[PDB]
Structure formats: C-alpha cells, structure tokens
Amino acid sequence: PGRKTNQLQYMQNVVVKTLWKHQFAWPFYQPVDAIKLNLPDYHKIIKNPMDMGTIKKRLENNYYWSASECMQDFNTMFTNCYIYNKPTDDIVLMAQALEKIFLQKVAQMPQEEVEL
Amino acid sequence: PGRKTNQLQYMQNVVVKTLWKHQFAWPFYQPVDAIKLNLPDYHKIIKNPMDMGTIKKRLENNYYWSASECMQDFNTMFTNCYIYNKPTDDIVLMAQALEKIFLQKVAQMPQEEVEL
Amino acid sequence: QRSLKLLKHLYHG
C-alpha cells in the first residue's frame, strides 16, 4: 500500500507536526460529521471529504506511496472548505492561514523523492 | 467612504508600482477569465476574485478608506492563487515570490495612517 | 503540467 520516503517523512515530521500545533488547526482534526454538526447539504456539495486527522493517521500507518498523495489530500481538505463555506466565514480564514504555512513548508521540502 | 492617506499613497506609488514591474506579475494584471482559460470549477472554489488591475483602479479612484483594506485585497489575490492551484504549480511559486516583495514593501510603509 | 495555468500555458503546461 505504501512505503517510507524522505518526502513523506518531511510531511509527517515537519508539515503535519507544525500544522497540528497551530491555533487554527482544530476544525480539521476530524472528518466533518454532517449529522452531529447539522450540515444537511455537506455531502451533496463535497464528494471527496478529507481532514488532517486522516492525513496524520495515513502517514503513521504508511498508507501513502508518495508525498504527492499527501500533498493532494491537504489540497482536497482546504479546497472542500472553500467550496462549502462562505468566503467571510471564520473557518475559511483559518483554512487560509493553515494553507499558507502548508505551502511555505512544501516550498522547502526535499525536491527529489527517495525511498527509505 | 473612500479616503486619501499617507499609507494609501504608499500602496499606490510604492507597492503596486513595484509589483507591476516584476516579471512574474502579468498573470495578476486582470481578473481570471475561467471560461477563456479553461479553469474547471474556478468560481466554485474562488468566491471572492481579486487581481492587481482592480486594486490599482481602486487606489487610483480613492475607493479605500484605509490601506488595511487594500492590503486585504492583495491578500485575497495571493491566497486565491494559493487556493485554486496545486501546491507545486509554477503560478504558486510566482505568487509566493510576489508576496515576498509585497511584504518587504509593507514593512517599510509609514506605520501610522494620516489622512492627507 | 506544472506550468498549465501559466500557459493558458501557465495554468496547463
């Protein structure tokens, strides 16, 4: 299913470890529960749900083959938030602050993926 | 209610002027035309479009009450690019380079805002 | 593909 790579190690120990500690990360720790949270249109609008708790567990369980998958899961998580919510909603401003840090760290990741 | 301030003068005659001359600025001169450019779901994801041509016109016509509002429009422009595109796309790297110059210029702006 | 949006080439290259 997956393997160890230098870029996946970077995603786990730099990207996720930094974002998890961020003051705005907590709305993204768990899948959106449309029943508990009273979001009757969430799954009508969002067909590919993703959250940072799922990403973190995938890294810990060596689910990913390439860091490109992990980066896309982050992109999906953020994009879903912008599609579902209004641009003035606090959760969207929080997502944007997290995504800027994500992209800062991505710019500094090892540029060649090497299996470890 | 628009206004003329020392900081808004700086946003027009330093920040916009500097960024416009940069070789990476041209994708940001005009609004993204999602139909012309074949950009799937652009307006589904980007609900608050912004571009530097619009910001320039706003400054030239005293649209803003405060430089803080203009700084917000720049942030919307950069973040929209970070949001819609994929983490390693060339245009994201261009936007990050322009944002670096933006932040350097903002750091040299007069710190207290005076109406002229 | 990384220059796609730039192309038309920038966005879709």
Numbering used by the authors:
A (entry chain A), B (entry chain B): 32 to 147
C (entry chain C): 2 to 14
Provide the publication's sentences verbatim:
These domains harbor a deep pocket that specifically recognizes AcK-containing peptide motifs in both histones and other gene regulatory proteins such as transcription factors. To begin to address this knowledge gap in an unbiased manner, we carried out mRNA display screens against a BD—the N-terminal BD of BRD3—using peptide libraries that contained either one or two acetyllysine residues.
Peptides with very strong consensus sequences were isolated from the screens, and biophysical analysis of the most enriched peptide from the di-AcK screen revealed affinities for BET-family BDs of ∼1 to 2 μM, ∼5 times tighter than the strongest known single BD–substrate interaction. The acetyl group of AcK6 forms the same hydrogen bond with the side chain of Asn116 that is common to all characterized BD–peptide interactions. In the second BD, the hydroxyl group of Tyr12 forms a water-mediated hydrogen bond also to Asn116 (inset). Instead, Leu7 and Leu11 form contact with the WPF shelf of the AcK6-binding BD. These residues, together with Leu8, simultaneously interact with the WPF shelf of the second BD. In contrast to large surface contact between the peptide and each BD, the two BD chains make very few interdomain contacts, burying a total of only 260 Å2 of surface area.
